[PDB]
Nucleic acid binder design. Structure first.
Ligand SMILES: [Zn+2]
Ligand SMILES: [Zn+2]
Ligand SMILES: [Zn+2]
Ligand SMILES: [Zn+2]
Length: 121
DNA sequence: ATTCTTGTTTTCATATCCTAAAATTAAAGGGAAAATAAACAATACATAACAAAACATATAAAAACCACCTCACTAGCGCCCCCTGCTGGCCTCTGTGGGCACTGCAA
């Protein structure tokens, strides 16, 4: 485990994908990459029978599509609710990240440093 | 008639032999002190026999040493999710762009 861990600092990727440029830190990530070229798909969502490449994708599918009463995530800055955490990530990166050079209002001279305040104005 | 050699008994003579008294001298006999020898008895040394102590061999008696087996630890590499975060389309809801019909005002 520690031998495998040290590549997280160094960056060694001693496992090459013979069919593309990808290179993984350990055996499992390479075996998981192989399904995309071979097209093998061992796992199956038992409810809708929709097809997926990856187990975790299926688990998130079940959680968002065939599950009830699941907790959501509220943006701290704005008042909108959205389902997935990673989409809350992309929301904070595209709308509430600090914009260095600023953006000016289309109709007045006021300049803003966050896209949210701009759209709100 | 007178003178001269030669042979044979007589008688002193001078060495020898015999005779006996001295002396004497060595033998020989006895008294006695050494004295070597010898017979016997004692001591010390050497040899042989018996009994015991010391040395060497066998054996087995614990006992020590070495090697193998075995039951673990130590590495080793996948194996398998699993969770978490970024990424790249996707789509639909606001929002950017525009054509154009419509109206209020004042000729
Ligand atoms: Zn590949
Ligand atoms: Zn499903
Ligand atoms: Zn927000
Ligand atoms: Zn403005």
């Amino acid at each position: 485990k520690l031998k495998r861990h040290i590549r997280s600092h160094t960056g060694e990727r001693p496992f090459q994908c013979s069919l593309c440029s990808y290179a993984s830190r350990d055996t499992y990530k390479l075996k998981r990459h192989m399904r995309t070229h071979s097209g093998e798909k061992p796992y199956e969502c038992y409810i809708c029978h929709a097809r997926f490449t990856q187990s975790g994708t299926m688990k998130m599918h079940i959680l968002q599509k065939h599950t009830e009463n699941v907790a959501k995530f509220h943006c701290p800055h704005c008042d909108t609710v959205i389902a997935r955490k990673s989409d809350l990530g992309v929301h904070l990166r595209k709308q509430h990240s600090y914009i260095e050079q600023g953006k000016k209002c289309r109709y007045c001279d006021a300049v803003f440093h966050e896209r949210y305040a701009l759209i709100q104005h």
